[model samples]
Target: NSRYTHFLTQHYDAKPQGRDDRYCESIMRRRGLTSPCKDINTFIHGNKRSIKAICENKNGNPHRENLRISKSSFQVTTCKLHGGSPWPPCQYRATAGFRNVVVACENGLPVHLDGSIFRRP
Candidate 1:
């Protein structure tokens, strides 16, 4: 995974299946990969192009900040901290839904996650 795919590996998981412990663990990790706790993480359950396409949403494309909101909705799973501070004894609650994700893009590729808006359908 280079810069682009690394970003995908870091945040996008095309195979999110509801709320499975192992499903969230591979991505979230028991130790937050290198820290005691990771406050929150949202995984997009779609192909990479679905995310890259957001960069071309002329309506929501940039504030000169390279930010854009996706024109289509995607299923995303968010793992959020509900317990533990900066250490283990960490806990998380997973929420999944359809959303229009806002992300930061560079050279037409999404590399940062800015936010997500729940979609009606």
Candidate 2:
């Protein structure tokens, strides 16, 4: 399925059906998919562009650092930059790999969350 679609169950209440067919399996069978756990946390991205492409092609876009329950939860596209810490010792510095676009997804998309380098200060 496309990524844009909400991952929640696509169940709609019963509508006024024709007299002939009052009720015919009105409730749809729930589909088993990855369920997102609700929580608040900080996210860091290393390769922004590669992430952006993955999410964009999958239909997800716009990467946000602090993700909450409101935004997308299906897939979390991130690029960790030194244990999720700021670089240059307090001063903000952007890395080449982290400069690319990154987008978060709400589906079961595989994400590589690894420490690309040590002492990224």
Candidate 3:
């Protein structure tokens, strides 16, 4: 649990306001990414075992370079556009749940979480 919390806190920026259509837009800017906001990110809602198992299954090492969690089982949290302006003033309704997640890492740290490697399993 601590690892999961640590990963979420360190990797993804929590949208306390929940999920809105502009969720990525606001998050990328606030998190200071870019206009197109092309940051590879992932949100996990499952236990640390399954998640950690990803690294362990790779060879019992979490510090491996370019660690890949491909074709695994996990949970993916989604957000919905609430109500308000699309820009300065916006809101999001977070839909919490479980799903399989795909991610790429470098030096045991996530480097990219884009759609190129993402899939439902």
Candidate 4:
């Protein structure tokens, strides 16, 4: 049961280290989608169940009906492509902070990462 629910397995982590030099490389390799760099990816850290709670009453939200946002902030690490050939070699910069995550859900679990709507509070 170490695996996660759907899309969350790619974007969220219950525990994450600070440096993406290894972390990003490992994640992209593990995901096997980025034969090279992924441009940018953000990974949020928190309890999957707690994160899922945002989806519990999501339908009422007007314009973003299919989306849910975390009720509290969680630690986030962003991995951005800085250098490298885009394949066989990938360079990334990692930064970490607390942020409220906004994601689209399906069947009460996250399936999309909405990087724009994140708030510091």
Candidate 5:
């Protein structure tokens, strides 16, 4: 499990806050991973084998159903992480327990906003 921990710790960058501190542009510029505006959901859904496998190896799989997030607990975690003021819908929550989650793709749009996420520390 050291490999998983090491990979998650190094790539995740959640000491201060997690990927919230990561800037899309800066990440692309520095790591050359991909465009900041790139569709994360598309990437995750398209490459489930690779992404899901990686997440499973590092973080445990979701305890709930299909990546649901319309629930209360999930909404709370999401709101806290995303910095939203409005209360999210109180529905069945989905499980996304890890640092790097391959976001689900909806309408070819990226889950996180282009400039919404940033480096915390």
Candidate 6:
């Protein structure tokens, strides 16, 4: 596994476990996105090769910091809605499907992936 791919997983995707109420709490803590606890994020479940090759594609900005890429044919799972109101209880679930993705990158790394913009590579 390339470092880029691993970085993608770390910063983007959350691990899968049985569908339980405490999943978000456990995952967010285990994934080390807690303390403040991230409330919303999307994770891509697809081929690592295809995802990684996006950097090589001649699209978006040549500079790594301004890099943006048009990605397609991937499954994006949105994890949303923290369960507890006060604090420390985070819970979410898959709320989307296989679709095209638009991602922005920084430092040769993907930082933002969203489905709002319609741009192709």
Candidate 6 accuracy as lDDT: 0.53
Estimate every model's Cα lDDT from 0 to 1: 0.67, 0.26, 0.44, 0.66, 0.26, 0.53
Instruction: Report the error of model 1 at residue 70, Å.
Output: 0.6
lDDT of 2 by residue, 1-121 (tens): 4433332222111122321111211211122111221111112322333333354444343434722111222222221222233332111112222222223344533233222221243
| lDDT of model 6 at position 85 | 49
Which structure is stronger by TM-score: 4 or 5? 4
For residues 48-78, could you state the per-residue lDDT of candidate 5 as single tens digits? 2343332232422333343312111111012
| RMSD in angstroms between candidate 5 and the native structure over all alpha carbons | 13.7
* Winner by TM-score: 1
Question: What are the runs in model 2 whose C-alpha is more than 4 Å off?
Answer: 1-89, 98-107, 110-112, 117-121
For each candidate, give its TM-score against the true structure.
0.76, 0.17, 0.42, 0.76, 0.23, 0.59
Query: Ten consecutive residues with minimal summed lDDT in candidate 3?
Result: 33-42
Q: State residue 14's C-alpha deviation in candidate 5, in Å.
A: 2.9
Residue pairs with clashing backbones, model 6: none
Tens-place lDDT per residue, model 6, 1-121, is 3655545754355335443435545555666656565665556666555565555564333433554554446655555555664255555554545665566554555655654332222
Model 1 accuracy (lDDT, Cα): 0.67
Question: What's the true lDDT of residue 39 in model 2?
Answer: 15
Q: Model 4, residue 16: what's the lDDT?
A: 70
Q: Model 6 misses residue 119 by how many Å? A: 18
Off by over 4 Å in 3: 1-7, 10-42, 46-56, 59-67, 70-72, 82-86, 115-121
How far off is residue 23 in model 2, in Å? 58
* Order of candidate numbers by TM-score, starting with the best: 1, 4, 6, 3, 5, 2
Better of 2 and 3 by lDDT: 3
lDDT (tens digit, per residue) of candidate 4 on 1-121? 2223546766777787655567876776676537756777778787777677766653223126566666677888776776656775766667676867777766656677776643222
